[PDB]
Scaffold this active site. Structure first.
Site, PDB file in Angstrom:
ATOM      1  N   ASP B  10      93.941  23.923  34.488  1.00 34.47           N
ATOM      2  CA  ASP B  10      94.342  22.644  35.080  1.00 34.47           C
ATOM      3  C   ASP B  10      93.153  21.849  35.594  1.00 34.47           C
ATOM      4  O   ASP B  10      92.374  22.354  36.400  1.00 34.47           O
ATOM      5  CB  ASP B  10      95.375  22.854  36.195  1.00 34.47           C
ATOM      6  N   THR B 119      92.760  31.255  35.273  1.00 35.91           N
ATOM      7  CA  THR B 119      93.670  30.257  35.804  1.00 35.91           C
ATOM      8  C   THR B 119      94.725  30.801  36.756  1.00 35.91           C
ATOM      9  O   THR B 119      95.244  31.907  36.564  1.00 35.91           O
ATOM     10  CB  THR B 119      94.319  29.470  34.625  1.00 35.91           C
ATOM     11  N   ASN B 120      95.066  29.968  37.755  1.00 37.07           N
ATOM     12  CA  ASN B 120      96.147  30.195  38.698  1.00 37.07           C
ATOM     13  C   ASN B 120      97.330  29.526  38.039  1.00 37.07           C
ATOM     14  O   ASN B 120      97.365  28.301  37.905  1.00 37.07           O
ATOM     15  CB  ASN B 120      95.857  29.571  40.072  1.00 37.07           C
ATOM     16  N   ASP B 181      87.773  22.638  38.920  1.00 32.17           N
ATOM     17  CA  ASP B 181      87.954  21.318  39.535  1.00 32.17           C
ATOM     18  C   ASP B 181      88.271  21.430  41.044  1.00 32.17           C
ATOM     19  O   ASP B 181      88.291  20.411  41.740  1.00 32.17           O
ATOM     20  CB  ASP B 181      89.048  20.515  38.806  1.00 32.17           C
ATOM     21  N   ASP B 331      94.021  21.454  -8.104  1.00 28.13           N
ATOM     22  CA  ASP B 331      93.576  21.895  -9.431  1.00 28.13           C
ATOM     23  C   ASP B 331      94.749  22.514 -10.213  1.00 28.13           C
ATOM     24  O   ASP B 331      95.765  21.846 -10.348  1.00 28.13           O
ATOM     25  CB  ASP B 331      92.331  22.800  -9.302  1.00 28.13           C
ATOM     26  N   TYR B 379      84.917  22.436 -21.324  1.00 23.93           N
ATOM     27  CA  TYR B 379      84.893  23.734 -20.641  1.00 23.93           C
ATOM     28  C   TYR B 379      86.176  24.539 -20.898  1.00 23.93           C
ATOM     29  O   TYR B 379      86.097  25.763 -21.014  1.00 23.93           O
ATOM     30  CB  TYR B 379      84.626  23.567 -19.130  1.00 23.93           C
ATOM     31  N   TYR B 460      94.585  28.893 -18.363  1.00 26.04           N
ATOM     32  CA  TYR B 460      94.140  27.916 -19.385  1.00 26.04           C
ATOM     33  C   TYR B 460      94.575  28.262 -20.811  1.00 26.04           C
ATOM     34  O   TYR B 460      94.393  27.433 -21.712  1.00 26.04           O
ATOM     35  CB  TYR B 460      92.611  27.832 -19.415  1.00 26.04           C
ATOM     36  N   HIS B 518      84.963  18.135  -6.315  1.00 26.43           N
ATOM     37  CA  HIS B 518      86.114  18.915  -6.786  1.00 26.43           C
ATOM     38  C   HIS B 518      86.790  19.816  -5.740  1.00 26.43           C
ATOM     39  O   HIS B 518      88.014  19.946  -5.751  1.00 26.43           O
ATOM     40  CB  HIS B 518      85.745  19.733  -8.020  1.00 26.43           C
TER      41      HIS B 518
END
Ligand SMILES: O=C1Cc2ccc(Br)cc2N1
Ligand SMILES: O=C1Cc2ccc(Br)cc2N1
Ligand SMILES: O=C1Cc2ccc(Br)cc2N1
Ligand SMILES: O=C1Cc2ccc(Br)cc2N1
Lengths: 541, 541
Positions: B10, B119-120, B181, B331, B379, B460, B518
């Site tokens: 906090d 933390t409290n 704080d 892809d 390719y 492919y 790519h």
């Protein structure tokens, strides 16, 4: 002899028929008789509907083409707010699974029949397509095959779809029963030599089906809920700490519902709940609790104290990216689940326990003192000494599970004066309980072969640590949604032990199962599902 | 020298402070100054708030006790629609992660610091507790430790919590920076020898933190999104058919979002998307596609045709109990995802593709004819002959991935005239791209050691089968919600190839990423997340 059964979807496995909406809209709108059915089938084998049924076009593409056919059919008939989209959305939404037909299909399959759905359907791309996706999903999983006209590019009554059906079934026509509500679609099946049933009313159709198969399908006893086939589930694995991984089975979408078994059980103890809860709209995570099945089973007693188990279940949620889950537990899992609600309420959407009551720790008494004040818990003292119970429980796993998993009237173990062992005057070859099949006992046998009983027994070996940790919660109350389910015939976790729970859980909801022993989920699966679903829908969303 | 950083929640890691609401409610309601802060801390170490902070009581139990303190504080001050519940619900809901503070904590940890939250806090059992559960979850996972007062039964400024913090950190006080704080809670930390920062405004606090650590935390470059540590994810496994199992990584709750990678990739290619999409309110399933990583990789070419891959993804949904998922692909995964929308629209909530356009099959041309009409796809011809590409790609996995995974300006492979191999005039030891770490390349190396490139390359090798199957969809349109994401610098799947998609997907939405090659997800992760989240929230719910 018949060995395959084929069912149509619309008007056979799902009612009311989408076809019966056009005739209903006609009457409601006082339109000429058969007008909407004429526009639907316009152009026959070359029309828009045949293109839709073959998968050439999607439903959203067909809607405008149907409207055109509706315009032309009204111009010829000399007649005149109207939406085909609205009519069809309403018709699809109203169409529900025809339960007695599904039940009959389920019975035939259980008796060795190959079952299939053969249907003239479409590629549904409507914004409300999920409704039908859900319907098809629930249905399809109960059959060996689903043949959809739009996926095969063939339609009933074309001869080729019937030869394709025989090919996928790998059966000759005389070995097939074919059920359809459209006489014309029944015709080619009969021509091949198949047994055919014209389905009008479900009752007569099932009488016809019962006569030809020689299997009782009508008036049969209440079927058990759908169970789980381990090999067909999605298996999940989460490492909560370097040496500890938790395994779970996952099914469905919606709010997360984490199922926590007891001792000496498995994720499989929830087999009858998993399909039902997923179908009810929940994402089910059925755990293998720490020490069990595919989850890690470290040997140290302290790895099994409630504090560590709860912390790891929080880590399990953290790693899966879940801010909350509803936690449902049975036996030791039910105890875990109350402590999840007390220590981590922010992570618990809602909590339910089967059999295990919530009794707060007595700060003025040792757990050993408290246990001795009840003959029912004497077994927990026998579990204290490391190695003793492991030896007897691991000696013969088949005998262990066959002796344990029994209905209330099938009692075989003498749980008082544990003589010197749980199996003192118990048979070496116990009979098979009406609650379990041999195959199911063997699943538990196979699970327990990995880690044995050490880890599971260690859940009982942290009384002092658990008591001290629990005393930190004595000023708290459980104020998140909660359900306590009592089993009339559980003689250890007796319903009476839950009587004061309201003092600590003021808004507690309840369920009660009559003629139910310790193994709640498999003893009374239908009633557990009814109670859980009703409570989830009202209190867990 | 400092090696640990401790932060309060906090008013430090979360703003605006819940403490700053009482003073705001005071002014808004024109109540006496500090009245609501007086009722809050009434009774000091013995008061209701200290009991709440220690975990003795839950928030819902404390609310009525705070109201009593509010009554007594107004009776003494001689003053008089009022709800503490409403005030606190609003305050908690308004409290958000203080991003620059989290960023600074993230930087310190990346530089070898041990980080913790001290933390409290309270046990939140309010009906709206999920809001804070979500906040704590997002925050906690970025720190080594989270110490909550209600879980440890100790509170700041009690000396014991500080000694407990040192114990868990395994560090001496002089090695710890402590940020708070509340001045009073900072005091015992300083007394031990710790470096302390009184946090008022984040900027000055970070200037103070930067000075003491000697690490730049303020004005630093834009950090990349959170990535995934493989060992910390939930791993799921689904058998879709006897010899085929699909592996996935799962994170978050909400609508199912199925991520489908391309070639030659992994579920890990989505590492920057998984935490972001889960935090955005989605249940992410990042697949290992068939042929990859922990998924099955059968050797047969035909196991990899689009028809079989799509059918298995449908079975994947069936087995998980999902009626739909939004499908996002890249892809080859992007190609799969368009065909899921065309053939299974009822199962696809929404569809998105990264780079891969939707170009319908040309029925008047062979895929071999079509491919030859573009130098960029040469390719794919080299990938046709079984064994050839596997040999070169499997030869040196480290070189394979280092050569492939590169930004647009880092090009090393000469993809035109594939000479006789992808690595013709490519270095044997390529440099490490700015897109990837060595550790990340090694993850892909380890994944590809199981099954190699056979299965991936077979994606492919089904051109003819894929073309015939695709021709069945030529009369259809994609009418479900759709997104096309183009990458400016992808020189194979060029943005220009997507120009005609509107003809087949009329309601298509678009995204475009400049200076992106790519490997979209790792090239521009921040922008991919922005585009996907914005589209999911508007079009997928
Ligand atoms: O009665 C009790 C008190 C108690 C505290 C903690 C755990 Br775990 C189990 C039990 N059983
Ligand atoms: O672990 C525990 C703690 C505990 C306290 C009391 C009784 Br009775 C049983 C148990 N079991
Ligand atoms: O251009 C095309 C046509 C086509 C059809 C099917 C599949 Br899979 C990929 C592609 N690519
Ligand atoms: O699988 C396929 C089918 C196909 C058709 C055309 C082009 Br160009 C590429 C591909 N890839």
């Amino acid at each position: 002899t018949l060995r395959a059964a084929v069912f149509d979807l619309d008007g056979v496995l799902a009612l009311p028929a989408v076809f019966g909406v056009l005739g209903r809209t006609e009457e409601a709108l006082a339109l000429p008789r058969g007008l909407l059915n004429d526009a639907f089938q316009k152009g026959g084998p070359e029309g828009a509907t045949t293109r839709l049924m073959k998968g050439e076009i999607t439903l959203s593409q067909w809607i405008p083409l149907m409207e055109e056919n509706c315009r032309k059919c009204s111009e010829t008939a000399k007649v005149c707010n109207f939406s085909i989209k609205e009519i069809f959305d309403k018709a699809i939404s109203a169409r529900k699974i025809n339960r007695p037909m599904l039940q009959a299909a389920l019975m035939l399959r259980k008796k060795g029949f190959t079952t299939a759905i053969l249907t003239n359907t479409w590629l549904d791309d409507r914004a409300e397509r999920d409704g039908l996706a859900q319907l098809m999903c629930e249905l399809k999983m109960h059959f060996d095959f689903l043949i959809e006209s739009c996926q095969v590019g063939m339609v009933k009554p074309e001869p080729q779809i019937y030869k394709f059906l025989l090919d996928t079934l790998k059966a000759s026509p005389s070995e097939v029963v074919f059920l359809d509500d459209i006489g014309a679609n029944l015709k080619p099946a009969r021509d091949l030599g198949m047994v055919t049933i014209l389905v009008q009313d479900t009752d007569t159709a099932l009488k016809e089906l019962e006569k030809v198969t020689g299997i009782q399908l009508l008036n049969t006893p209440a079927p058990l809920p759908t169970s789980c086939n381990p090999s067909d589930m999605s298996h999940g694995y989460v490492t909560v700490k370097p040496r500890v991984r938790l395994h779970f089975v996952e099914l469905g979408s919606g709010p997360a519902v984490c199922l926590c078994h007891g001792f000496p059980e498995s994720w499989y103890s929830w087999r009858y709940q998993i399909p039902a809860l997923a179908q009810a709209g929940y994402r089910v995570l059925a755990m293998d609790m720490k020490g069990y099945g595919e989850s890690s089973a470290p040997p140290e007693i302290e790895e099994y104290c409630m504090e560590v188990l709860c912390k790891e279940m929080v880590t399990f949620l953290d790693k899966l990216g879940l801010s909350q889950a509803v936690f449902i537990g049975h036996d030791w899992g039910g105890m875990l689940v109350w402590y999840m609600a007390l220590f981590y309420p922010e992570r618990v959407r809602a909590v339910a326990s089967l059999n295990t009551p919530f009794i707060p720790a007595n700060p003025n008494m040792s757990p050993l003192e408290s246990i001795k004040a009840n003959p029912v818990f004497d077994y927990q003292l026998y579990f204290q000494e490391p190695g003793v119970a492991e030896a007897e429980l691991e000696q013969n796993l088949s005998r262990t599970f066959k002796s344990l998993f029994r209905a209330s009237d099938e009692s075989v173990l003498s749980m008082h004066k544990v003589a010197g062992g749980l199996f003192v005057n118990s048979p070496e070859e116990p009979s098979l309980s009406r609650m379990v099949t041999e195959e199911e006992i063997q699943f538990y046998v196979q699970q327990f072969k990995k880690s044995g009983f050490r880890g599971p027994l260690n859940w009982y070996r942290n009384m002092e640590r658990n008591w001290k940790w629990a005393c930190k919660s004595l000023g708290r109350k459980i104020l998140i949604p909660a359900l306590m389910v009592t089993a009339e015939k559980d003689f250890v976790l007796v319903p009476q032990m839950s009587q004061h729970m309201e003092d600590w859980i003021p808004h507690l909801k309840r369920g009660h199962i009559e003629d139910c022993g310790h193994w709640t989920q498999m003893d009374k699966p239908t009633e557990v599902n009814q109670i859980l679903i009703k409570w989830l829908d009202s209190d867990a969303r």
